[PDB]
Ligand binder design. Structure first.
Ligand SMILES: CC(=O)N[C@@H]1[C@@H](O)[C@H](O[C@@H]2O[C@H](CO)[C@@H](O[C@@H]3O[C@H](CO)[C@@H](O[C@@H]4O[C@H](CO)[C@@H](O)[C@H](O)[C@H]4NC(C)=O)[C@H](O)[C@H]3NC(C)=O)[C@H](O)[C@H]2NC(C)=O)[C@@H](CO)O[C@@H]1O
Length: 129
């Protein structure tokens, strides 16, 4: 599913991400935009051989099991395929774990390079939320 901007804002709010660990909703919508362009099905292979999955591009070296990243931790205890669903609950729940792991949202390198320090509030402009 390719979400629309306000539809994704509304689903992420509903799953408790607005202000989760201090990060307002515009941060999470900006991260999904540049990580996956709002597409739940996005996968990207990494040079260490891991693959990043879904809307928030959660990586298989640490967070999910895809059966082909040797010696990866599966900290969200989820097959990586679960993160490509049209329903974002698995992605939001694993993201909540990731953002609590000591480095906040700097774990999403498109957030750090394209959203961090910008007016993220523009990402939820106009949405009935
Ligand atoms: C090609 C490219 O850039 N791809 C990225 C892809 O790599 C992105 O996925 C991210 O990858 C990085 C690197 O593997 C992940 O960062 C590491 O995450 C672990 C777990 O949190 C960090 O370990 C933790 O570190 C803190 C202190 O630093 C400790 O207190 C914790 O206890 C410790 N946890 C454990 C279990 O040890 C580690 O330090 C990070 N390493 C670095 C170099 O930052 C990152 O989590 C991962 N992000 C996601 C969302 O999965 C992906 C997303 O940006 O997109 C691009 O594909």
């Amino acid at each position: 599913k390719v979400f629309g901007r306000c539809e994704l804002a509304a689903a992420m709010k509903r799953h408790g991400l607005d202000n989760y660990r201090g990060y307002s909703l515009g941060n999470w919508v900006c991260a999904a935009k540049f990580e996956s362009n709002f597409n739940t099905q996005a996968t990207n292979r990494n040079t260490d051989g891991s693959t990043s999955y879904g809307i928030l591009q959660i990586n298989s070296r640490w967070w999910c099991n895809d059966g082909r990243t040797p010696g990866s931790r599966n900290l969200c205890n989820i097959p990586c395929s679960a993160l490509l669903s049209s329903d974002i609950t698995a992605s939001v729940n694993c993201a909540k774990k990731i953002v609590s792991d000591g480095n906040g949202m700097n774990a999403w390198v498109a957030w750090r390079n394209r959203c961090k320090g910008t007016d993220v509030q523009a990402w939820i402009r106009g949405c009935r939320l």
